[PDB]
Design a protein around this ligand. Sequence first.
Ligand SMILES: *[C@@H]1O[C@H](CO)[C@@H](O[C@@H]2O[C@H](CO)[C@@H](O)[C@H](O)[C@H]2NC(C)=O)[C@H](O)[C@H]1NC(C)=O
Ligand code: NAG
Ligand code: NAG
Ligand code: NAG
Ligand code: NAG
Ligand code: NAG
Lengths: 656, 200
Amino acid sequence: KIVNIGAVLSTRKHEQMFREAVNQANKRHGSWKIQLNATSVTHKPNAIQMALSVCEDLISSQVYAILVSHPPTPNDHFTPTPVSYTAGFYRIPVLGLTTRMSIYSDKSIHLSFLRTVPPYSHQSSVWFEMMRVYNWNHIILLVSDDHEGRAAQKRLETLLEERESKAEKVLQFDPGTKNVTALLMEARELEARVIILSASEDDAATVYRAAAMLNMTGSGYVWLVGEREISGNALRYAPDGIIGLQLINGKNESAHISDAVGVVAQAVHELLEKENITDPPRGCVGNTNIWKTGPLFKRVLMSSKYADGVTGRVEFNEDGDRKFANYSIMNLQNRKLVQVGIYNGTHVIPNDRKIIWPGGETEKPRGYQMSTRLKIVTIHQEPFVYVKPTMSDGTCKEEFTVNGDPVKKVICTGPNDTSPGSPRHTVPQCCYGFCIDLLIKLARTMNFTYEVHLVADGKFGTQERVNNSNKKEWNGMMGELLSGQADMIVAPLTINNERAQYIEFSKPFKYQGLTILVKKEERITGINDPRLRNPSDKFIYATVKQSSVDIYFRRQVELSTMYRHMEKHNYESAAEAIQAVRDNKLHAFIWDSAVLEFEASQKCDLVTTGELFFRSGFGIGMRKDSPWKQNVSLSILKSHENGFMEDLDKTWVRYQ
Amino acid sequence: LELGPGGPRARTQRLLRQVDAPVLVAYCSREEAEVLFAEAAQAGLVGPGHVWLVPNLALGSTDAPPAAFPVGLISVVTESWRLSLRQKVRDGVAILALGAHSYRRQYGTLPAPAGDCRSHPGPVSPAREAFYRHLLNVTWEGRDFSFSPGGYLVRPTMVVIALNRHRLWEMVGRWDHGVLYMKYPVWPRYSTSLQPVVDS
Ligand SMILES: *[C@@H]1O[C@H](CO)[C@@H](O[C@@H]2O[C@H](CO)[C@@H](O)[C@H](O)[C@H]2NC(C)=O)[C@H](O)[C@H]1NC(C)=O
Ligand SMILES: *[C@@H]1O[C@H](CO)[C@@H](O)[C@H](O)[C@H]1NC(C)=O
Ligand SMILES: *[C@@H]1O[C@H](CO)[C@@H](O)[C@H](O)[C@H]1NC(C)=O
Ligand SMILES: *[C@@H]1O[C@H](CO)[C@@H](O)[C@H](O)[C@H]1NC(C)=O
Ligand SMILES: *[C@@H]1O[C@H](CO)[C@@H](O)[C@H](O)[C@H]1NC(C)=O
Ligand SMILES: *[C@@H]1O[C@H](CO)[C@@H](O)[C@H](O)[C@H]1NC(C)=O
């Protein structure tokens, strides 16, 4: 019996070397019972023509196996794809030795394709090891919009997530495009200092140019990419002191061919000891069904662990990839890559050439940079947030309190009463009051500088589906925090489960609850009045949409009927509902205690009712990761034992 | 499951004995579907008190349900599943024609046809993705055929069909894009051959 083994080459030398490798396999095992023969074809620039050649040459003979390598010209990186589909039509195994694209790594489209070298996406694995090397956490991902980029993104996010770690942020960009600096801008000011990247050679050159002209090569900053991003023009545009990743066997196609022939010989010899061996179809025309041992061959080739590899023991993974990879890490010192480490299958050992980081140092810098300048988001609420337009000088007329001290007024930028009727021109008005007072107190306590501005949309925000019932996301300040537009939530906000499910809160700086306002028997009996226990059309009652009480009424399923009334009359702010009640347009308004008794004690034309049925706290809520949590908690607790907010209450809410 | 030719039944049947669900959802090929239906037949999990679900992939010809297929199986397909091939061809030709006519309405020109096989054009011929965009939104006979950015049909109107008590595949309900309809507010659990049982 004679078995044909196919190769796709265009060297005219590795072809004869492949024939010699077939002869070597025969020498190693013997072809007396089962003769072995070789066949070589030449991949052509025209994909249709080369596919036709494969069909009418490699299928015209009952060839059991086929391999392929990349051409020298970088044109048509997906040259094996027609060969892969040709093999797939009869479900034939195929080997690609030189491909680094995760496109071929898919087995839904490429059933029996096997690749010796893992793609660039598997490169991700070493970065994780890099993270273990330097004990870093503040990872920023930058990646192209190509499928390879998304696959690498998924692999690396998986790798970082089994260690209960998460990337600080991810950025996607369109390959081949420019003006990436703007994207870099919105990634420039983040507290992280270690960077990862995935792109193509030209894209790598573009981002290198941008970073160089953006002074991103300074101290603290550092990043790592693959081989194609540190080659040719990309290497030309790369800065010095940059670290790089290298294959142990990047360019020796001959070694790949040798190991491939060896593993093919092992697999076929394991096959020939079995029965029911079906010959591959002879000629595309006349055969239109599946080959039977094809899937069998792939099953026994997953299990094929080829020890006699020139590059070592070749063990395929679950997906036909060489496990325990052999890499190296170089440093680009003075336009040359110099050895700084060797990556054995799971870890790295350094040897020499201590890493000269791009900032000009040789000692390892922390991949983080704490920011004293912090972002502050707020919402208008008169008892806690007084907002007033500034006059011509850029500020507003400051005035002194009854005690004689001036009120501290910060520059808060608001889109000119944000609304459809607003021009959305974000004028810097002045904000002052309770919350601003406690911010400046705790700020001078922690010495950190601050930037204050209220929320854009003026709404609290709730977990809502994206437009057409797509995934859930946060609105308002929670939206800007899960996106990073701000750092803490400084407002009389209501603590709850879902916010705590995504954000965290300190100890509440204020204790409060819920109550109702009406005008001026007919006393609405708190919450237990059938006027509200049973929803009634003649009676109007509502709150602000996308607020905490919305979640309250949503979780209280038995109260859903009143929630049904909510859908008709929900307001957007407090002042207009207050006017409506004063105009008797709204019969009753449910809202938070503190603001409400403040308004009642000030205006006296409206009356509050109902006890604080929902005990709750106004606390500083902010991100789980940042370290200020405990610091701010202990600071506000110290102020509480100092009665500082008691003085603030005397200043703002009491004496009215 | 392995479900390949000559797959070890002990390894599979043992875990099936370890399976205790009354309601199931499965994924496999049509040949794998036949194999697992036989395997569950000797497993006894085909019984009326058992429910199993499957996508369209493990289904062959709707008009040719193999004997291995058990009674009461249910899935969902396109409404055109009862339309003859001629109707499908006519609808496809109509989709292409209306896309081309929309291209003419926007610009007044026919879509440029493709070239031959001895070369390959590099650029995308901006008229071609203009035609693609006008093909991204298709409506014919009230049935929208607007495709997805993923290269397939998005937001379609589906029909849920179920194998009947006579080993006949018939439609039980319809999913109209936000609404479900279906017959049989209870499922007839035929006594492994016929005669559905009244639940206690
Ligand atoms: C490319 O790989 C081939 C193996 O297929 C190398 O050839 C052998 O390499 C080993 C490794 O040192 C040597 O011990 C043998 O003497 C080599 N044999 C021959 C006939 O050359 C080859 O050296 C590699 N070349 C490069 C540039 O990497
Ligand atoms: C780079 O040069 C200096 C040093 O960082 C800085 O002031 C300047 O704004 C930077 N320019 C750009 C375009 O990043
Ligand atoms: C990977 O590295 C090891 C350790 O240096 C070495 O034997 C060889 O380069 C590779 N091993 C295998 C099995 O490929
Ligand atoms: C792979 O190399 C690492 C160091 O690079 C070393 O621990 C060992 O040789 C290999 N890893 C394991 C887990 O054995
Ligand atoms: C001033 O601020 C810095 C950083 O915010 C801090 O390290 C330092 O201790 C502060 N000093 C005082 C007196 O608050
Ligand atoms: C289809 O969408 C295009 C925009 O991509 C639009 O110009 C055209 O009018 C739309 N036609 C229909 C029938 O929706």
